[PDB]
Amino acid sequence: HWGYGKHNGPEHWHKDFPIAKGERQSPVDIDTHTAKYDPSLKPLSVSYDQATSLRILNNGHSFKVEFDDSQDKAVLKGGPLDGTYRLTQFHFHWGSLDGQGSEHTVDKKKYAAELHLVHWNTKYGDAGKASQQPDGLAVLGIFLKVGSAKPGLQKVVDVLDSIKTKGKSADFTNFDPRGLLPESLDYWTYPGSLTTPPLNECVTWIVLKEPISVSSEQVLKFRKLNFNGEGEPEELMVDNWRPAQPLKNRQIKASFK
Ligand SMILES: NS(=O)(=O)c1c(F)c(F)c(S(=O)(=O)CCO)c(N[C@H](c2ccccc2)[C@@H](O)c2ccccc2)c1F
Numbered sequence: 001h002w003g004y005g006k007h008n009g010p011e012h013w014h015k016d017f018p019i020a021k022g023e024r025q026s027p028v029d030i031d032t033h034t035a036k037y038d039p040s041l042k043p044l045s046v047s048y049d050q051a052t053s054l055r056i057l058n059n060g061h062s063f064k065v066e067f068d069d070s071q072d073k074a075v076l077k078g079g080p081l082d083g084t085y086r087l088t089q090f091h092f093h094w095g096s097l098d099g100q101g102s103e104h105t106v107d108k109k110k111y112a113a114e115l116h117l118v119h120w121n122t123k124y125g126d127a128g129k130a131s132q133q134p135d136g137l138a139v140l141g142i143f144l145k146v147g148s149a150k151p152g153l154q155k156v157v158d159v160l161d162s163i164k165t166k167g168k169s170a171d172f173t174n175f176d177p178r179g180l181l182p183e184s185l186d187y188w189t190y191p192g193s194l195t196t197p198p199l200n201e202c203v204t205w206i207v208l209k210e211p212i213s214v215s216s217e218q219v220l221k222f223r224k225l226n227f228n229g230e231g232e233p234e235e236l237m238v239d240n241w242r243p244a245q246p247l248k249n250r251q252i253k254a255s256f257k
């Protein structure tokens, strides 16, 4: 099946998912100098106060924390969005070393990791149906640089030893995703896709300008996860990022400057 290695990695995905070479694929390089400031864009509304995390799982591609999205509890609205998007999960992409790991890049700069908070448009009723629509999903992307620790990430890092291999999961309640956000909500936005198969072109990307800093010890815990199930050969889960794809006929908009 698909993955991130030489024989089944991003350059191979188009064979099973031909949209991989489509007109609105993600991630992209964000050219800060040619993004267009749009003074008409609204501030992003991030209403995470009633978030209810439920579980964390290693799916053999990343790890993900899943939320109760059966009611409006943790939602994203405003910015470039029409209507209300419900948070369903977050996950990360990261590198084998600190100089790569992010999917979006900024002026060709790669971060050590990128956090994706995935939300679905409540007019579509569920994430599956939303994934089939051009305005189905909004993904809030946040870059991680290595430096000071992020205290609000610690609860995540400390449970990862319990989900080392593909298919392991644990209950994971009362995690506050507000503790992963940087101070600023300034952002770039463009229309794109999921960055993993099936690569649906259904995402409004909102990528925050300000990275969060995480420590070396925090990212080192990510890199101890395994892609494999227990009892297959050990392959560390690292470099689970798709590289920048061509922008094609898109303009990236900025909320600032
Ligand atoms: N970088 S990305 O944001 O594009 C991305 C990922 F990188 C990613 F790893 C996942 S994943 O679910 O953790 C394993 C690969 O599916 C998902 N999950 C998909 C998803 C979850 C919740 C809501 C919408 C989409 C995936 O599970 C999916 C794909 C297609 C249709 C429904 C669900 C994902 F969206």
Ligand SMILES: [Zn+2]
Pocket (backbone or CB within 6 Å): 091, 092, 093, 116, 195
């Ligand atoms: Zn992602």
